[model samples]
Target: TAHRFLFVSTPVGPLGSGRGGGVELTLPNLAKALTQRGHQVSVLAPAGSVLPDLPLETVPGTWQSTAQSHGRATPAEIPAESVLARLWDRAHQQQADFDLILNFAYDWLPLYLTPFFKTPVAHLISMGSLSEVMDQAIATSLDRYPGSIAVHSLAQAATFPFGDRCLCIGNALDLAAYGFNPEPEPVLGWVGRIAPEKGLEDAIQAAQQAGLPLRVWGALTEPDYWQRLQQQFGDRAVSYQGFVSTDELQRGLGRCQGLLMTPKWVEAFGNVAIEALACGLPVIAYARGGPLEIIEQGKSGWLVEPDQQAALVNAIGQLSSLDRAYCRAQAEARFSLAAMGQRLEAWLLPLLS
Candidate 1:
């Protein structure tokens, strides 16, 4: 039987803006996948969001601060204008239209309010354990509703006390949207926000050691961090490509020899890694967090020891041995839109019953 779903997007920023990070991409991809499976879906996002294909209800208010920007003990702070609060108010008022509510925010309010709604509110948490308040809220929700929470990876769920209880559905991409290229330029690639946690500096250093320029792409979220890297490494080691649409990114990524992922923190899931795989670009990522689950050692990509710069440099040299075609096949077999939609339906359907 078909069901109606209301997807509440992250309030940190509007869709299409890189401010919401991977969740922005995740929301639309999952919505479209579910829609293709004949489910009715509608989205509620912050003002300025634009999703041409889906039914969108934009709520106007100040955006919430990203959970990654705060300390573990930091208390929940809703902004004066509070877009998250307002979005939920609308969801509460319009609950009857949907059978279930799926929350894409990594905030506290939604989890805390889960029990208050008669409609089953399922949370697809975007990040790993970042805040104590968030972990507690998730735990509280689980205590009330046993299988209400789902995360991107097991590495992510392991961060919380009730990790074993949280379902790991992973993620997917539209393979057709990505172009594959067996031949690539000598230059390496690095994609993610220019933040300290993304470890862009490490990628630059590794690229310099390997004698290849690194083409960097993502939102310049931390301008000072980027400027400092430029002062230290200069243009010879790295070049900024600026943030681009998925079409442009896939085309640009298809030309790179391989991608370097050096995240300093626990990335719940690395959407960029699969995007690289879809482009027939092997990924050399640190053996930490989500990449550990994504990369098949010595096959699709190589995983180096975390923070080991020399190991990263060594991995870059071995990219030629891996088959780019195998990388694309792995993405198609495991991370396609159809595969993810099936996993999501299996996880969600029981709740409706």
Candidate 2:
């Protein structure tokens, strides 16, 4: 019951950084949840990690290439000479200290190296099948370590050829930390990385179509993309608030009427959608990936057809009708850290046994 578990986060970005990065959000939440359940949890992340509140161990390494940057290009191996191997090497040396290792890294090296370790490695895969190398590596791991691969959503798992084999754990958040605000202002919200794959342009266009000003937030990974949007939107709509702290982020987001999610790719899971819901803010997301599973149609939030800006604009008009109280209640019932913790414990129990 008191088994120790080590969580290894993605090497591409450190924990507590990357404004809209989902893995950063999940890694800490999972650690906190597991800790509450009385399991000793430790984290293995890059040196610059600022998970100061958690029991963390930093590994010296360089950053690996981001999947989004690759677009349609597929690498034969992990990129930039692969810095993930450095993280794995540290884990290999420290395997004896923990009962199990939970990998949050979406890179291929960790999956391929799993069989060589004596201690069990349970991978909480963060992304869909982005590359052939990654897909094959995961398949190989699954063949060797049965029931070890877990995903955030079924939509994400479907991207893999061996989709049927992966476990869908979903995601959770600290309900206590997210303060609900039923009486919000007249403004709309859009939270995520200011990158191409996130489809921030669609949200901006939809917000303008609905005659509401969109409050944009998150890290600007692409300055050129952001500049192009600024040039396009001009002074008519959209306001970039830049990357902010968690407390500030919630405070800024809580005052909004509803959130707009527009993802170009199959979002493994949309962490911000639930975060908005926790704050009693309705989400008008493109009906794709994790948002489709999270939103209960007209109940908790609205789901428009994927990549349809007009549909999102239409949903924005209906936002006032959605029950903010029910949204908060739904969050309490399903997406709390306690529930996430319980689900994770149940899943790992069989592995521990």
Lowest lDDT 10-mer window, candidate 2? 72-81
Candidate 1 lDDT over 1-353, as tens digits, reads 88999999999989987777788778888988899899999999999998889999999999998788899899999989899999999999999899999999888999988878988899998777888899899999999889989998887889788999999999889787999899999999998777776688889999999999999888775678877888999857888876768898998998999999988755526788999999999999988778889999999999988888899989999999899999999999888889989988988988884
* lDDT score, candidate 2, position 295: 91
lDDT for every model?
Answer: 0.89, 0.82
Candidate 2, 1-353: lDDT as tens digits: 67899888888867776732778788888888889888888888887788867788877756877765664457745555355777788888999999988988777778878878888889998878778778888999889878888998887889898999998887888888889997998889988777886788888888898899889888776788877888998755887765656787788888899998887655536788888899999998887777889999998899998877778888999998799989888888888889988878776767753
Off by over 4 Å in 2: 68-82, 194-198, 220-236, 242-244, 266-269, 307-309
Question: Each candidate's root-mean-square deviation in Å?
Answer: 2.3, 2.8
lDDT for residue 309 in candidate 1, whole number 0-100: 87
Pairs with steric clashes in candidate 1: none
Q: What lDDT score goes with residue 189 in model 2?
A: 91
